[PDB]
Structure 1
Amino acid sequence: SPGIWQLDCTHLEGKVILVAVHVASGYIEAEVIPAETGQETAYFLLKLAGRWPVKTVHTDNGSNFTSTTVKAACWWAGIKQEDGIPYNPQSQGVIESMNKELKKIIGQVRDQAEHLKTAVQMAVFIHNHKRGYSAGERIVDIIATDIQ
């Protein structure tokens, strides 16, 4: 559970926002890309796994699950690549609610920057700091408890 992440892809302004959620904490990382490709997803996962101890990734769709480039990145980074089938039906709603929240925050800051990527990183910051513990606090505590 400390090492479990979920990929999520949402759309805004004709661009793609790729999100990784640490399932146990709600902590996120995100990036803007022109379109979701295997190569972009693979690079995103490489970045993620260099920064946090990623054991398992539930992929966001079948194309990324199938992608040999994504499989290669997961091999390289020591990640178990899994499907994202919501065996628990509450998973759909949770991700739906997160995308809605994220877009709301992006709207609240969108005029503080020209580029969507800047607004998305502001939204990541606000989400991860929001308190009673924050997602940023929870992920660190969860992983530290695991290490020891």
Structure 2
Amino acid sequence: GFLDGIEKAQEEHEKYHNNWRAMAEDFQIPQVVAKEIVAQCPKCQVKGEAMHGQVDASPKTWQMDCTHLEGKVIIVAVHVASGYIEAEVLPAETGKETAHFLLKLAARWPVKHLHTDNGDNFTSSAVQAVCWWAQIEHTFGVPYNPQSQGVVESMNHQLKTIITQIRDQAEKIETAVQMAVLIHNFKRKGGIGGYSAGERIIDIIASDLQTTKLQNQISKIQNFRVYFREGRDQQWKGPATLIWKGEGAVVIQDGQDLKVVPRRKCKIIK
């Protein structure tokens, strides 16, 4: 058999730290045993899993960061779902300037979700007081993981390239920062719908407001309740609201949850 092969492969991995294919070809043991022998070693197991996440893209979510340029401190805030950039220059990296900039941004545009890193200025009592008064959900990323707020770092790269492009037309650096914001916002097209940033954020917020008013005026005068049968057992659930009657399936709302049920397992009561 190969039981002495299993014992000798355990001692040989204890000494040499082979991979599983070398033991499975030298000692003629099956591959599952060699993979388990490799998997039960703590000196091994140094590798990720090779996958990427997907950040939030709600229509009222902003991300914020701070960067350095020519010894100055720039602060960048980006609306995520369209790519809308606001930027300022701070005299220092304290918490009062970040709280004042966040208050100005919350006074200009509707903000309901803010995403930041674990810096010393974003986690402060002044920023917490501004978030409490303006009712903003403040969330932080994982420490030492800059890929969480990837949008604002990409916008840092774009803003620095534009600043290096139009540097020779201004004297100070603050004027060049504001001109780079204008050039990025209204003079660069291409993307989702062929829009710039300002047309895209206008379209997103206007479509959100119009579809909320339209679905309220539709759903306030509805009828035709639907009793449906789903689950691993053939049970019956209570009163659900019919949303759309389609050729093949229907859309039901139950407990403020939307589901798609085929037409064989549902009955409509007027």
TM-score normalised over the length of structure 1: 0.89
* Residue pairs, 1:34-113, within 5 angstroms: 34-85=91-142, 91=148, 93-113=150-170
CA distance in 1 between counterparts of 2:86 and 2:62 reads 10
The amino acid across from 2:157 in the alignment is K
SS at match of 2:121: helix
Alpha-carbon contact 1:65-1:81 (below 8 Å) kept: no
Residue 141 in structure 1 maps to residue 203 in structure 2: yes
- Assess if the C-alpha contact under 8 Å between 1:59 and 1:82 holds in 2: yes
**Structure 2 vs 1, CA of residues 12 and 97 (structure 1 numbering), >3 Å: closer, same or farther?**
same
Question: Alignment partner of 1:45: what SS?
Answer: helix
Q: Is the 8 A contact 1:9 1:60 kept in 2?
A: no
* 1:1-56: CA deviation from partner (whole Å, max 9, x where unpaired): 11100002111010111010001111010001122211111001111011110001
Look up the equivalent residue of 1:51 and give its one-letter code: R
Mapped contact 1:9–1:19 kept (Cα < 8 A): yes
Instruction: In structure 1, give the amino acid aligned to 2:127.
Output: V
More RCO (CA 8 Å, sep 6+): 1
Between the two proteins, the alignment pairs up a number of residues equal to: 147
Q: Aligned match of 1:121 in 164, 172, 178?
A: 178
Does structure 1 residue 14 correspond to structure 2 residue 14? no
Secondary structure of the 1:32 match is strand
Q: How many percent of aligned residue pairs carry the same amino acid?
A: 75
Q: Structure 1's 17 and 59: CA in aligned 2 closer, same or farther, altered over 3 A? A: same
Contact 1:27 1:136 in 2 (8 A): yes
Measure how far apart 1:62 and its partner are.
3.2
- Residues 63 and 152 of structure 2 are in contact (CA less than 8 Å); yes or no, is this contact kept in structure 1? no
Contact 1:6 1:84 in 2 (8 A): no
Following superposition, the deviation at residue 61 of structure 1 comes to 3.2
Q: What CA distance in whole angstroms lies between the structure 2 residues aligned with 1:145 and 1:64?
A: 35
- Structure with bigger helix share is 1
Question: What is the one-letter code of the residue matched to 1:136?
Answer: G
State the TM-score, normalized to the length of structure 2.
Answer: 0.51
**Structure 1 residue ranges (4+ consecutive) displaced by more than 4 angstroms after TM superposition:** 88-93
Which moves more between the two structures, 21-30 or 101-110? Answer: 101-110
Q: CA RMSD for the aligned pairs? A: 2.0
